[PDB]
Design a protein around this ligand. Structure first.
Ligand SMILES: Nc1ncnc2c1ncn2[C@@H]1O[C@H](C[C@@H](N)CC[C@H](N)C(=O)O)[C@@H](O)[C@H]1O
Ligand SMILES: [Ca+2]
Length: 749
DNA sequence: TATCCGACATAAC
DNA sequence: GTTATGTCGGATA
């Protein structure tokens, strides 16, 4: 038998596409030419064509140099559209063996292409594999393999695993369809009504890619529909009559896709799955049943789902489910076209440009279903739209429109079976206009593991079981606390930064420069006790900088890099090329908080730093911080706050003054409570000192953390918890919920 | 001025 | 290539 296809076959087929593209067979013809070939490869390996008829024809009626191949394929494409009654009586016997196929797939005449030896062999190469068991992974890898890395990233062109679609469609509709099936399966009447209900269901993916959500869904429906016909069978031991019993078909699936090639795959993907299932039902009940020629057609539109009215694809009143995996694009990574798309959907809302592109599909869906509250929706999305600065900008608008979250998958790692897996963490948000009396939140122990369904009273805009209050960005703290500041941002392409060895090479080469070096600490250098230096030129005497060539060359390298920038303020900054782009350095010693750091720690390692070391923008800091405040930011309570209202990078903690610290509710303490927290603070500090040559990473890894440090932190929480009057169960659940009662009491005043 | 963020970036097994 | 865990500067206000 022939080797079944794997991912390497789709990738090879993709190279055929780009090989054809490079000789000028471009555009619409190219996309449909290839998807036609795909159908032929599947067809000869099933019973649509006689076994291997396509391959044999190419091998016997086509020249080895590939010179004539495209002529014969062009006539083949015409035959497959010509019913047998309209074929020339003298048509080549070998060509006459091919069935009439028709359908939107073969109706358009196409310019003939041109092949050579290697393109012919590549296509015969594809023929020799078995296309019989073609799956989402194949359709997705093919879709992905024709795209530049920059394109793949920017359209979010990442196909969705079988597994990730199943976590989305099982709660959305599928599981309930199996419960309902099992309850009526023994009543011929109710089973008949159940079939008609299955036939009338429509599925709508407004960013459908290569169609996997539609393909998996249609396959599950076909599988269900087999057991339904098994049920209904009133002929006992006679062969079940499929053609007049079957109903479900591709005309129930609808999709929008901006690139034509995935929009063409999605269509053929649905027909191949159709035939795959027709063969499977033909096996169960032993009688041959195929839907050839292609009389039913999906409704995939090639368009821009953010610029059109979805009702042109599918009238809302005739629609049932909206599902899919829309593209993820950060606020500062999106092209002028997609920012404008984003802003069209959100109108004149404040800071709406700060949303991920994926957020755009939510108000669209929310406006679309306003005319039919029976629709239920679910979207994969980057977990970022449930964290930090975006929660305030997306969920006020969604809640105001009636949108209610009915189930949700919390953060998990992305993956699929194709090349170049993207590195992003995800959520799944099921929503609609009807509250559900049984909301489930699926939780993950291993970010890579399988989920566990947990009952939920309510589902937060953060996807938590709690109240619907959102923590908003603030420029100053709601509590009585000293202001916090952002570290200095260099924008220097590294020209002002050095390793110790570099600082030594540079000093010997330019000894007059020692006066201008100062210690440089980012988050990574501080957490890990690594040494780094910067040239600190804020307020340098120009008579001293003229003397020094090596420095002058750095200042010129900063300026040249800064002019090449694309952000006008950066270009502007090129004309002060010896000063950091943003400067915040204090005059007093300060408390440093790293910006981005491992979620595996129970506390964010913070600490005190000398006023002469320059802190990078990968950190925050409080100038002249009394020990009490170091206790407060060390506390479980603060870190629980940071964990819940802060943002994340994939999943690492990301601190930010305006989201965490400034919204942090904190009651001012007595003199005894204040002295207590100070005493624990010094106990933590001392506990750290007693371990030379341990970096803060080594000390705050909770595996390797010394018990003497854990105790001082336990001493500290007790003092801070006392200031709150917090007596509750000492869990992240009870602490989060209690801080939000405090936050709301303050935000109500 | 003043950032939050990254279908990530990249040094380390 | 996996695994572990934080840079750097854009875009916007
Ligand atoms: N404005 C847009 N309108 C319509 N489609 C878009 C738009 N932006 C990106 N896309 C497409 O969104 C898709 C995102 C993918 N994650 C979908 C893949 C698809 N779920 C699959 O399983 O294969 C890409 O295929 C894009 O071409
Ligand atoms: Ca074959």
């Amino acid at each position: 038998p022939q080797d079944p296809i794997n991912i390497k076959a789709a990738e090879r087929m993709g190279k055929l596409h780009d090989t054809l593209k490079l000789v000028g067979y471009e555009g619409h013809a190219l996309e449909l030419y290839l998807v036609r070939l795909l159908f032929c490869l599947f067809a000869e390996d099933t019973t649509i064509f006689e076994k291997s008829l396509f391959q044999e024809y190419i091998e016997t009626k086509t020249l080895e140099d590939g010179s004539d191949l495209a002529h014969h394929i062009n006539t083949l494409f015409y035959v497959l559209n010509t019913p047998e009654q309209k074929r020339l009586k003298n048509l080549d016997e070998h060509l006459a063996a091919f069935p009439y196929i028709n359908g939107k797939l073969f109706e358009e005449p196409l310019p003939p292409a041109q092949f050579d030896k290697a393109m012919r062999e590549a296509l015969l190469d594809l023929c020799s594999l078995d296309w019989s068991r073609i799956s989402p992974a194949i359709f997705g890898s093919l879709f992905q393999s024709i795209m530049d890395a920059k394109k793949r990233r920017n359209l979010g062109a990442h196909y969705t695993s079988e597994a990730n679609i199943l976590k989305l469609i099982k709660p959305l509709f599928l599981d309930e369809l199996w419960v309902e099936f099992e309850k009526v399966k023994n009543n011929k009447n109710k089973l008949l009504a159940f079939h008609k209900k299955l036939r009338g269901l429509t599925f709508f993916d407004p960013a459908c890619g290569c169609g996997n959500f539609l393909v998996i869904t249609y396959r599950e429906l076909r599988l269900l529909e087999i057991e339904v016909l098994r049920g209904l069978h009133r002929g006992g031991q006679q062969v079940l009559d499929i053609e007049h019993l079957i109903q479900i078909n591709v005309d129930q699936f609808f999709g929008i896709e901006i690139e034509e090639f995935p929009a063409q795959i999605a269509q053929v993907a649905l027909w191949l799955t159709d035939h795959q299932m027709n063969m499977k039902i033909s096996d169960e009940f032993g009688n041959y049943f195929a839907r050839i020629p292609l009389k039913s057609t999906p409704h995939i539109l090639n368009a821009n789902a953010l610029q059109i009215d979805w009702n042109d694809v599918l009238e809302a009143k005739k629609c049932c489910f909206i599902l899919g995996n829309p593209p993820f694009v950060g606020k500062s990574k999106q092209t002028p076209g997609q920012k404008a798309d984003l802003l069209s959907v959100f109108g004149n809302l404040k800071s709406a440009s700060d949303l991920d592109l994926v957020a755009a599909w939510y108000p669209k869906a929310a406006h679309y279903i306003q005319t039919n509250a029976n629709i239920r929706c679910a979207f994969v999305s980057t977990n970022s739209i449930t964290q930090g600065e975006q929660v305030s900008l997306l969920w006020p608008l969604l809640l105001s429109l009636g949108i209610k979250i009915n189930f949700a998958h919390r953060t998990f790692s992305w993956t699929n079976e194709a090349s170049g897996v993207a590195a992003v963490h995800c959520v799944i948000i099921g929503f609609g206009l009807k509250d559900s009396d049984e909301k489930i939140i699926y939780e993950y122990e291993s970010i890579n593991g399988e989920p566990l369904a947990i009952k939920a009273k309510n589902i937060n805009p953060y996807l938590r079981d709690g109240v619907d209050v959102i923590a908003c960005k603030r420029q100053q703290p709601i509590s009585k606390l000293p202001s916090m500041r952002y570290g200095n941002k260099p924008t220097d392409d590294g020209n002002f930064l050095f390793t110790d060895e570099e600082k030594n090479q540079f000093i010997t080469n330019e000894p007059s420069s020692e006066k201008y070096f100062r210690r440089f600490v980012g988050g990574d250098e501080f957490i890990n006790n690594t040494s780094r230096w910067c040239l600190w030129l804020d307020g340098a005497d120009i008579s001293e900088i003229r003397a020094m060539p090596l420095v002058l060359a750095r200042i010129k390298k900063v300026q040249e890099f800064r002019l090449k920038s694309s952000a006008k303020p950066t270009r502007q900054s090129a004309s002060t090329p010896m000063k950091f782009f943003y400067i915040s350095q204090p005059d007093t010693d300060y408390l440093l908080i790293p910006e981005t750091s491992s979620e595996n720690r129970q506390f964010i390692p913070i600490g005190f730093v000398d006023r002469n070391v320059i802190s990078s923008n990968a950190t925050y800091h409080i100038p002249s911080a009394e020990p009490l405040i170091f206790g407060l930011l060390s506390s479980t309570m603060h870190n629980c706050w940071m964990r819940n209202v802060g943002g994340r990078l994939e999943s690492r903690y990301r601190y930010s003054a305006s989201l965490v610290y400034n919204t942090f509710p904190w009651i001012q303490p007595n003199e005894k409570q204040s002295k207590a927290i100070e005493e624990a603070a010094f106990a933590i500090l001392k506990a750290r000192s007693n371990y030379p040559n341990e970096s803060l990473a080594g000390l705050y890894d909770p595996k390797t953390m010394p018990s003497e440090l854990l105790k001082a932190h336990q001493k500290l929480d007790k003092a801070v918890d006392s200031v709150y009057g917090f007596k509750g169960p000492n869990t992240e659940i009870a602490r989060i919920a209690f801080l939000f009662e405090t936050y709301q009491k303050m935000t109500s005043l």
